[PDB]
Amino acid sequence: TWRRWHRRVNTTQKRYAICSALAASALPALVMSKGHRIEEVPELPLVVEDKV
Amino acid sequence: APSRNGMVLKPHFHKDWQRRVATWFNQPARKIRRRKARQAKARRIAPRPASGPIRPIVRCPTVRYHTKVRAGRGFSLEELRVAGIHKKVARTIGISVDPRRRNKS
Amino acid sequence: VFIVDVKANKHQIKQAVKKLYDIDVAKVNTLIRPDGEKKAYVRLAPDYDALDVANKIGII
Amino acid sequence: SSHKTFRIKRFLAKKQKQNRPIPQWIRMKTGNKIRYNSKRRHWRRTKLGL
Amino acid sequence: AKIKARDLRGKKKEELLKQLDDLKVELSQLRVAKVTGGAASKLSKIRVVRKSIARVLTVINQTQKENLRKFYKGKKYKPLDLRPKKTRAMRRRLNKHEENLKTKKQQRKERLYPLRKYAVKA
Amino acid sequence: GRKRPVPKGATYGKPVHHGVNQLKFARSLQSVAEERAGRHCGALRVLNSYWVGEDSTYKFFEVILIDPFHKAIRRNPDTQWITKPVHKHREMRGLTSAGRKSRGLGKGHKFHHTIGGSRRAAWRRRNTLQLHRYR
Amino acid sequence: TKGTSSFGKRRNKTHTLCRRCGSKAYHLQKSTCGKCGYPAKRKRKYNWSAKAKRRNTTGTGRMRHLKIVYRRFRHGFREGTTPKPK
Amino acid sequence: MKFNPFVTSDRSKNRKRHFNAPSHIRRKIMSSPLSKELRQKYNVRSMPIRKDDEVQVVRGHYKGQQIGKVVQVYRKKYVIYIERVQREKANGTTVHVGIHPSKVVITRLKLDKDRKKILERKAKSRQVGKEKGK
RNA sequence: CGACUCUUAGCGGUGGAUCACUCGGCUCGUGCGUCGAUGAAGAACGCAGCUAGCUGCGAGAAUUAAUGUGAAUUGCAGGACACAUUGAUCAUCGACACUUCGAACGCACUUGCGGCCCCGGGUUCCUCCCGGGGCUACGCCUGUCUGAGCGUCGCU
RNA sequence: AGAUCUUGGUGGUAGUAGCAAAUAUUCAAACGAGAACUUUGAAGGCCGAAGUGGAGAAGGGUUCCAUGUGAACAGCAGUUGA
RNA sequence: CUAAGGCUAAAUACCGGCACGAGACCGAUAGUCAACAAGUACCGUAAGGGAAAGUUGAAAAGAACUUUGAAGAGAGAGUUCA
RNA sequence: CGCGACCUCAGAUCAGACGUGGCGACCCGCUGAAUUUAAGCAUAUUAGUCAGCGGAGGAGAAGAAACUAACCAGGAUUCCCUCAGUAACGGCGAGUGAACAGGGAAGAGCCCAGCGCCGAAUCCCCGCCCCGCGGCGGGGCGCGGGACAUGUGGCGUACGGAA
Ligand SMILES: [Mg+2]
Ligand SMILES: [Mg+2]
Ligand SMILES: [Mg+2]
Ligand SMILES: [Mg+2]
Ligand SMILES: [Mg+2]
Ligand SMILES: [Mg+2]
Ligand SMILES: [Mg+2]
Ligand SMILES: [Mg+2]
Ligand SMILES: [Mg+2]
Ligand SMILES: [Mg+2]
Ligand SMILES: [Mg+2]
Ligand SMILES: [Mg+2]
Ligand SMILES: [Mg+2]
Ligand SMILES: [Mg+2]
Ligand SMILES: [Mg+2]
Ligand SMILES: [Mg+2]
Ligand SMILES: [Mg+2]
Ligand SMILES: [Mg+2]
Ligand SMILES: [Mg+2]
Ligand SMILES: [Mg+2]
Ligand SMILES: [Mg+2]
Ligand SMILES: [Mg+2]
Ligand SMILES: [Mg+2]
Ligand SMILES: [Mg+2]
Ligand SMILES: [Mg+2]
Ligand SMILES: [Mg+2]
Ligand SMILES: [Mg+2]
Ligand SMILES: [Mg+2]
Ligand SMILES: [Mg+2]
Ligand SMILES: [Mg+2]
Ligand SMILES: [Mg+2]
Ligand SMILES: [Mg+2]
Ligand SMILES: [Mg+2]
Ligand SMILES: [Mg+2]
Ligand SMILES: [Mg+2]
Ligand SMILES: [Zn+2]
């Protein structure tokens, strides 16, 4: 049971990866290459009002 | 057998260590349990401060740490006496007391 | 011939037969069967007839 | 032997009573999974514990 | 034509024992039929009569036990089967009175210096 | 002292364990006497004991016992503690004054063997390998 | 002959059924069970055989009283009460 | 999805519970939908199957609008028997074919005080839910 | 020509691999954390209409009562069950019951044998026989009663 | 692919070794689908009272008795059987 | 600092027990010895040792009936989507 | 030469209670190896470990300084991080090896004996009555028994305490 199942990652690297994922989510080619069927979405950084 | 350059290592694994290995898979559960106990205690003493009694200002002992200052165990009886608080009423009103602490200065 | 409780002795068997069949018994011989049951041969008094006593018991 | 104690005789009585085949109607029960008495003992093949 | 416990609880000891005796006699007749072949109905009635015997006997025992509980209620010493049987350790432990009685010093402390309800402004 | 109970003095092993005589029991004779009194009167609770005399071959102690189920003991606070289940055979768990002295308990630099409650507790703490989730 | 011929001479039982633990290990001549040690008050039990311990430990039998204790614990060992009659 | 930490979603645990359920909850398991008319009349959807109610089969070989009385609720085999739902065996005798109660629909309920009571209880619960969710 | 042998293929045997399945495990975590002289754990023996094992139960013996539920159990048979002058089954389980060994407790057991106090019968109060009921272990605490001592004394 | 590997299965050997310690069987009949072996009768033999006879102890534990069956078992067979 | 007297909850431990939840685990020679009448069958005087063994089908609808055989076992027929 | 008191012992199937045995993963007290490593081996190591014995509880043990320190000082116990594979031990070889300070989880303090004062103020048991039953308590009554001056209770405990 003491296989060392868990890994610790640097906080700065985890924040770096979050920033990279967010930046990639705003590019239509990458979101399309994830196969997300965005061909009629009006604007890729899709923002809606707070009423949602 | 040593192999070229290296550090002379002394592992302390000659004493059947695998019978006594403490895993930590209950660490998140322990943290959750401690948090629930803290919240239950804070609810139980409803207007009283959640952390507990006030602690005295206390200088750290040795020459490494005497520049720092921290929280002690309880206010000394001399401090209570000159502050005009009874040593049996202080703990009722939430003042931690320490009868064995002295005041050198 | 009866199959009786294994803990019942000859006196108890005699009194039980006397009470719940209203017959007088001459003697009781007792064995324990190989299957563990106890078997009692109860010989009745000469004035009591085993044949019609067995009839009124219902084992003819 | 012919001379035996009551405890030994009772033990042999229970062994006799439980050394018998299964009833036929058992195999018609729902979800039986029992074909035969697999605890059958023969006096010459295997000997008793005592 | 079965017998229930509810209408047996009304009856008293004499007729309860009479009915138990009748049930035992009928059970003996049913065993005679079982060994002499008999009929399927008479074989199936064996369980009915046995459970009726159990019913009468449990009613008798419950009535007797509750009568004894009434008789021994309010007495210092009671039979062991009438005393409670929580657990051996639960019976050994202290009772509520001597569990919570205090010393005069202790209650003087509680009287003089009771814990206060307070709040601390930030 | 405690002679090693081996036949003919033969302790089959390395010479460091060949000792039969000059060996000493870890607990004192007062603790042994308390243990014997408690074992005989297992329905009582050992409280303490004291020395009343000695010979060249015998030591005499007097052991105080408490009947925990007597009403005078049981109805008295400051005495009700001895009646708790956790306080039975204190002399056999080494919790009386005499039996406690052999455990090496105490505060300070002379008693580092038993930090944690006892020698076995300290040994388990010091010989347990803490393998955290994140190494 | 130390083998087949000598096996014909065994007609005297060393052990019999033990009135405690019901095992055929009651040495008659020593009057003691080799499995439980019956005339001794305490059960014979050794930590060098965990298999032997788990063969006869608690739960391997009926637990007639412990089943009832486990059930009764869930309601605080209540006694003297009955469900509200209908 | 499921959020209660005391109900399991383990497949083996659920199957063990289902196949070792005692009869008084096998009764709840062996429930059938009511017909559209009965669902209208009594404001309930489903009902545990019962000895003497009339059902029709909606799945399997015996599909049809023919109505048959239940004649047996074999809870050990999780099946029910219906009047004309049967087949001939080799020696010419007829045997009932057991079908699951979820594959029938109840067209007439065997009504007594207990069935009526359960009907109003289910209806009241559904009405309370509708009023809460309105 | 045939036999026999070898190779390959089709089919058939033998065998139970592979695959798919899984009311089982293993591991981790959580909450409780409760045995026993009021007789435990363990053991033995019995208990079903047809029942050997497993399971359940204890001479009230594959279970009684009570409560909840609400028409079955089911291998066959049988018979209940107006489901309201109350209910099958199942679950729960708080009432009752719970054979013999076993710390095991009258003494003893690879067998058996007592003693004491009541009650019933044969006797026809007196204690012989039979049956039933209740007692009869060791250690130890408080108290009680009966005592012992050329132990220390007092009075005579 | 190996570990005189672990578990399971299967070959050649091979229809082979073998079913050879203690003298011995034969005739007719019955039952039966079926008889070298079962039963009955006749004959010839053996144990030869320190028995291949009649009964017990220990041990076995239902093997005892009757009826029926002919799957498997009784190293051939069986209508017989512990 | 004040021994040779005493008590004291919380934080801590938990491969036994009761009841649960889960898993980048194993998938019937694996995973517990034990998925199954498993600490069972069986072995040993005893201490003790200790297995093998899952799967018809949706539903028994588990092959009526005819026919050869003394039967096992076959040929037809029949159930089934098979 | 009897009757009393006390002391020290004994018996009882005396009245009423209590202990025994099981489980034993975790915990407490003891006892306690050898395989192994040292490329041999004896000290050492394995290891205060396996096995063995006893005793508990839902936790246990510990615990409110005859402490740490040497500072401008901290302040019961227990657990975690670190100190630290360090100080030290060791055929100074193989190997073994803590603590203080610091940061946290938790946090809670107290009681006798003794010295004294108070007309033993104290306690148990048995009867009677009432209020309760549900773990058997409350209140009162007894020229009712016993314990106890060879010391019970109240005040009081090193932080001082009392009048
Ligand atoms: Mg006889
Ligand atoms: Mg033999
Ligand atoms: Mg005081
Ligand atoms: Mg050495
Ligand atoms: Mg030899
Ligand atoms: Mg001998
Ligand atoms: Mg093939
Ligand atoms: Mg009932
Ligand atoms: Mg004798
Ligand atoms: Mg004198
Ligand atoms: Mg291979
Ligand atoms: Mg290779
Ligand atoms: Mg040949
Ligand atoms: Mg030959
Ligand atoms: Mg001759
Ligand atoms: Mg002879
Ligand atoms: Mg014969
Ligand atoms: Mg043959
Ligand atoms: Mg396996
Ligand atoms: Mg497979
Ligand atoms: Mg054949
Ligand atoms: Mg196919
Ligand atoms: Mg007495
Ligand atoms: Mg070496
Ligand atoms: Mg070497
Ligand atoms: Mg060597
Ligand atoms: Mg050990
Ligand atoms: Mg114990
Ligand atoms: Mg403690
Ligand atoms: Mg302590
Ligand atoms: Mg102090
Ligand atoms: Mg470092
Ligand atoms: Mg060391
Ligand atoms: Mg904190
Ligand atoms: Mg005083
Ligand atoms: Zn034994």
UniProtKB/Swiss-Prot annotation, chain A:
Description of post-translational modifications: Citrullinated by PADI4.
Disulfide-bonded cysteines: none
Record localization: Cytoplasm
Subunit structure: Component of the large ribosomal subunit. May bind IPO9 with low affinity. Interacts with RBM3.
Role description: Component of the large ribosomal subunit. The ribosome is a large ribonucleoprotein complex responsible for the synthesis of proteins in the cell.
Recorded family membership: Belongs to the universal ribosomal protein uL4 family.
Protein's recorded name: Large ribosomal subunit protein uL4
Protein's gene: RPL4
Segment of the intact protein contained: 107 to 158 of 427
Curated annotation (Swiss-Prot), chain B:
GO molecular function (one): RNA binding
GO process terms (BP): blastocyst development; bone development; cytoplasmic translation; translation
Tagged with keyword Ribonucleoprotein: yes
Localization per record: Cytoplasm
Positions where Phosphoserine occurs in the chain: S51, S76, S105
Modified residues (N6-acetyllysine): K15
Chloroplast keyword on record: no
Main location: cytoplasm
Annotated tissue distribution: Higher levels of expression in benign breast lesions than in carcinomas.
Top-level taxon of the source organism: Eukaryota
Annotated keywords: Acetylation, Cytoplasm, Disease variant, Dwarfism, Isopeptide bond, Phosphoprotein, Ribonucleoprotein, Ribosomal protein, Ubl conjugation
Gene Ontology CC annotations of this record: cytoplasm; cytosol; cytosolic large ribosomal subunit; cytosolic ribosome; endoplasmic reticulum; membrane; nucleolus; nucleus
Related illness: Spondyloepimetaphyseal dysplasia, Isidor-Toutain type: An autosomal dominant bone disease characterized by early postnatal growth deficiency, severe short stature, genu varum, platyspondyly and severe epiphyseal and metaphyseal changes in the lower limbs.
Biological function: Component of the ribosome, a large ribonucleoprotein complex responsible for the synthesis of proteins in the cell. The small ribosomal subunit (SSU) binds messenger RNAs (mRNAs) and translates the encoded message by selecting cognate aminoacyl-transfer RNA (tRNA) molecules. The large subunit (LSU) contains the ribosomal catalytic site termed the peptidyl transferase center (PTC), which catalyzes the formation of peptide bonds, thereby polymerizing the amino acids delivered by tRNAs into a polypeptide chain.
From Swiss-Prot, chain C:
Induction of its expression: May be down-regulated by GNL2 (at protein level).
Domain of life of the source: Eukaryota
Localization: Cytoplasm; Nucleus
Description of post-translational modifications: N-terminus is methylated by METTL11A/NTM1. Citrullinated by PADI4.
Subunit description: Component of the large ribosomal subunit. Interacts with LYAR and GNL2. Interacts with MDM2; this interaction may promote MDM2-mediated p53/TP53 polyubiquitination. Directly interacts (via BIB domain) with IPO5, IPO7, KPNB1 and TNPO1; these interactions are involved in RPL23A nuclear import for the assembly of ribosomal subunits. Interacts with IPO8.
Function: Component of the large ribosomal subunit. The ribosome is a large ribonucleoprotein complex responsible for the synthesis of proteins in the cell. Binds a specific region on the 26S rRNA. May promote p53/TP53 degradation possibly through the stimulation of MDM2-mediated TP53 polyubiquitination.
Domain-related comment: The N-terminal beta-like import receptor binding (BIB) domain mediates interaction with IPO5, IPO7, KPNB1 and TNPO1.
Family: Belongs to the universal ribosomal protein uL23 family.
Protein name listed in UniProt: Large ribosomal subunit protein uL23
Annotated organism of origin: Homo sapiens (Human)
Gene (UniProt): RPL23A
Portion of the full sequence shown: 97 to 156 of 156
Swiss-Prot record, chain D:
Family assignment from sequence similarity: Belongs to the eukaryotic ribosomal protein eL39 family.
Keyword Chaperone tagged: no
Source organism per UniProt: Homo sapiens (Human)
Alphabetized SUPFAM superfamilies for the sequence: Ribosomal protein L39e
Protein name, per record: Large ribosomal subunit protein eL39
GO cellular-component term (any): cytosol
Lineage: superkingdom: Eukaryota
Subunit structure: Component of the large ribosomal subunit. Interacts with IMPACT.
HAMAP family per the UniProt record, alphabetical: Ribosomal_eL39
Location in or out of the cell: Cytoplasm
Known function: RNA-binding component of the large ribosomal subunit. The ribosome is a large ribonucleoprotein complex responsible for the synthesis of proteins in the cell.
